[PDB]
What does this fold into?
Amino acid sequence: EVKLEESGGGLVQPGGSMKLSCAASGFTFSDAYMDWVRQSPEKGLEWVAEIRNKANNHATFYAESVKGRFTISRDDSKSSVYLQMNSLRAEDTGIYYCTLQYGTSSWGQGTTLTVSSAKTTPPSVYPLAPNSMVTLGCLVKGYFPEPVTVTWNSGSLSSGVHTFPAVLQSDLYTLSSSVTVPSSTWPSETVTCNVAHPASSTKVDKKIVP
Amino acid sequence: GAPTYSWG
Amino acid sequence: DVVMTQTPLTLSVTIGQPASISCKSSQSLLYSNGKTFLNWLFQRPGQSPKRLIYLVSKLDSGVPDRFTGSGSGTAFTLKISRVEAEDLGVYYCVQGTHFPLTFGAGTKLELKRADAAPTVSIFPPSSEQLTSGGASVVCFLNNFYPKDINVKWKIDGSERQNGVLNSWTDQDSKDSTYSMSSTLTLTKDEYERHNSYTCEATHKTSTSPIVKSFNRNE
It folds into this structure.
């Protein structure tokens, strides 16, 4: 069975350096080209780099966006392929996959790279208050890194909940969470969003007041 | 056997 | 180099019914040796892409028989004879004829349900945030279907683009609906310069937009 396992991902500042490693097994490694592919929401799937087999004298090839900043290498004796990435930029952010696409197709689990200036910052949690149903929300603004967790009345309201994916402004994440309850339950009974930001060891309980 | 690309 | 264009960006499918998705290349994928190096990948959420099809129409080991690839030159098709639950996710076409290896932006196979108009809610800045010197205005467009929706902000009746960020949920596990948040971020100073704040949703379920507004001074 062909197995590719990547490591070396993490958080790095723009201008910084990171080395990805891929341990391969289940094919004659010496004879294969190896290819790195990355994935981001904004650019989708992108070929990054190729290193060819001993026959082609380990010939290396790079995407234009990456030329002069990335170096692909290989250790034939350890069945390992590497990607040294220098002068990293925000746009290099994404999931990096080690792949065998030579006479077959096999993709690793991937390793996540995040290129950001941001320091650990807890969220500011703001209440969103205004038929038979009423919608309430919490605005969770200006935190770093991901994730935050949001529950409603400590998870007793889970049914009518939407927590939206976080977006970035100026290196900081913001999201909102909505909850829909019968109009008979609020304002009469309390509704609180419970916001946890593990990286800042932050808990906020925001009661929604009319 | 089952190639992805032409430059194999 | 070679640009790969996939149509539909989203296909709505019923489990048991067929699916067809298109891939087009900016130049011919026919190679010198007679081979055409068009591949189809499939990606489940949170999972690595996996090749289903290579050389236009050849199935990878263990790929179900309901998958068929076809085409030549610049026009290619992936078909599913009868969609199963495991087939929901993103399909990418991948060109291996011309150096660099190049990918389509993908086609998301989504589950069809009944049309549903969004529940639209608008929220003023909290007193807490205003205290803090900030002013975010939030609009939720909740539990609608199909995924496509247009949100417009109006401040004092006039459209506004600057400071707006949108986020969509994935198709709801229980509901099969979509939800969207729109957030207008102003300074306190800028928020206090205007009185009327409006969120407008346009969705296929009505030719008439859903309008929700508040006044800064109520």
Remarks:
- Residues 119-215 of chain C form a domain with the Immunoglobulin-like fold (CATH 2.60.40.10).
